[PDB]
Design a protein around this nucleic acid. Structure first.
Ligand SMILES: Nc1ncnc2c1ncn2[C@@H]1O[C@H](COP(=O)(O)OP(=O)(O)O)[C@@H](O)[C@H]1O
Ligand SMILES: [Mg+2]
Lengths: 352, 61, 62
DNA sequence: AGTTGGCCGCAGTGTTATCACTCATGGTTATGGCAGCACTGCATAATTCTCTTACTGT
């Protein structure tokens, strides 16, 4: 088992012409050993041995059954049990054998990553809570979109977290940043996925079409791990401890106006604590893909029938349609702003 | 063939009628499929470029 | 219907597709082909709006 | 005095040789039942429509 260096030295000194016996004398090795190593391929310094029997082998299946069906992980309890069965050794071997079965405590070290310019964006929601806006109880939610390289922040308040609202907020973010990223990171929302099909993710077909339309590649971090999108979560903490702490409002339009003004004043103006530069300069450094001229229409699409007289009803509303549109089927495109339009076989109805 | 002369079929694809034999790996089978699917039909051929990219790129100029 | 999404002729621009006549598609929207049992075929390069028109006509039928 | 066990006597069973009877097969003729086709009705299963529930992650 002469080590790498010893074997190299033996072979080299032997090939140099030095006599073998005095080589052995110099290196303090037996002459037979040195001579055998002369005609050897490479330094031998490794011995392979397979596993061997231990004391806790007969009890091992029983302990494994205890762990995997009774959920017992108390080394003292298992030791006391098996001691009656016949075991006589200490607990160290038991702990060593049982350690792999134990759950892996979550780490505390946190890797840091710096995405390339115009290469990544992050999105998330924040359930603000229930408020009485204009005498109406609604569930307010905050949508936050954080750029990855410039740390920009766009935000907007909404009353619902429907796929339509998500897509519209993404449109607003893309317009705000003057382009679309090459990658957009969400969490595992059903408006973007439909579960992990054996490790792989199954994208919602409509959302996949939307992404292919705007060209941005979706990504999802992982189940029950929000660290991977720390930028946007920390931006949420920033906004909810700086803007929505004492600000008072009565209309969501007013709140959104105040939020945009606040962002453009301080949030996207104050230099970041890590990049140490105003986010707008980095934004100017960003290179996002151009937006399409026509935005992906995100509006509720329903089919309704006009009554005999010509009175058409949608939600708690009523219209008066010409007699030619009575008893037929029409399309009611409801934009998220409340602009309802009526269509009949492509044509647009001048609804009264 | 079962839907032939019974119900309409809406087909959409980007491969010419000659490539069907290659796609299905059979010449006469594709020929018969097309003979039945094209008997009573209205074929629309769309000539242009990919909207999402080309149209926006050429109209933003 | 198992459509991947919902679209209609309203969101379709015939100026970007001037090669084919607009009137024929409007006629198809009358669903006269369902009685004649004629088959409707859309052929063109990728991304030119084939599936959009097909799904729009399917929506009109539904 | 009664019940059970043992011994004796009687009856039943097994093997070998012999005898008798019944059943099976083949050929011809006659009769009855079953099978096939057409039409109608009922029930069950499958399909369609509507509503509710389930699963996973935030
Ligand atoms: N003429 C058009 N007008 C409006 N939108 C269009 C048009 N052509 C394509 N699109 C958009 O492109 C998408 C349709 O592409 P599609 O025809 O499905 O390509 P493919 O047939 O290769 O799947 C839709 O999202 C649609 O909004
Ligand atoms: Mg979230």
């Amino acid at each position: 088992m002469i080590t790498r260096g010893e074997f190299f030295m033996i072979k080299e000194m032997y090939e140099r012409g030095m006599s073998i016996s005095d080589i052995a004398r110099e290196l303090g090795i037996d002459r037979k050993t040195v001579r055998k190593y002369i005609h050897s391929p490479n330094p031998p310094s490794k011995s392979k041995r397979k596993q061997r029997k231990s004391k806790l082998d007969p009890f091992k299946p029983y302990l494994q059954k205890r762990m995997l069906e009774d959920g017992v992980f108390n080394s003292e309890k298992l030791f006391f049990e098996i001691r009656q069965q016949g075991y006589t050794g200490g607990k160290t071997i038991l702990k060593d054998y049982m350690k792999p079965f134990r759950e892996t405590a979550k780490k505390k070290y946190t890797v840091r990553y710096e995405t390339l310019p115009g290469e990544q964006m992050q999105v998330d929601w924040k359930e603000v809570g229930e408020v009485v806006i204009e005498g109406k109880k609604v569930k307010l939610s905050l949508f936050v979109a954080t750029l990855g390289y410039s740390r920009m922040k766009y935000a907007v308040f909404t009353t619902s977290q429907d796929q339509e609202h998500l897509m519209e907020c993404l449109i607003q973010s893309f317009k705000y940043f003057g382009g679309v990223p090459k990658k957009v990171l969400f969490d595992n929302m059903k408006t973007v996925t439909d579960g992990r099909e054996q490790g792989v993710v199954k994208w919602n077909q409509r959302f996949s079409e939307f992404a292919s339309y705007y060209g941005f590649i979706p990504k999802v971090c992982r189940p029950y791990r929000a660290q991977t999108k720390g930028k946007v979560e920390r931006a949420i903490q920033y906004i909810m401890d700086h803007f929505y702490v004492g600000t008072a409002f009565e209309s969501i339009e007013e709140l959104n106006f105040l939020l945009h003004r606040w962002l453009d004043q301080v949030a996207n103006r104050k230099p970041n604590a890590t990049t140490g530069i105003s986010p707008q300069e980095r934004w100017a450094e960003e290179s996002l893909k151009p937006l399409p001229l026509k935005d992906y229409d995100t509006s509720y699409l329903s089919y309704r029938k006009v009554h005999w007289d010509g009175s058409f009803s949608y939600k708690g509303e009523q219209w008066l349609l010409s007699a030619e549109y009575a008893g037929k089927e029409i399309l009611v495109k409801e934009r998220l702003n409340g602009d309802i339009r009526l269509y009949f076989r492509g044509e647009e109805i001048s609804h009264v | 063939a079962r839907r032939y002369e019974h119900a309409p079929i809406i087909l959409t694809s980007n491969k010419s009628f000659g490539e069907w034999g290659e796609i299905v790996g059979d010449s006469v089978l594709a020929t018969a499929m097309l003979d039945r699917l094209l008997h009573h039909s209205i074929i629309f051929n769309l000539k242009g470029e990919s909207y999402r990219l080309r149209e926006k790129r050429l109209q933003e100029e | 219907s198992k459509l991947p999404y919902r679209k209609t002729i309203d969101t379709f621009d015939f100026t970007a597709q001037p090669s084919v006549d607009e009137r024929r598609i409007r006629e198809l929207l009358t669903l006269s082909f369902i009685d004649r049992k004629e088959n409707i075929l859309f052929l063109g390069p990728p991304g030119i709006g084939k599936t959009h028109l097909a799904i729009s006509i399917g929506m009109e039928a539904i």
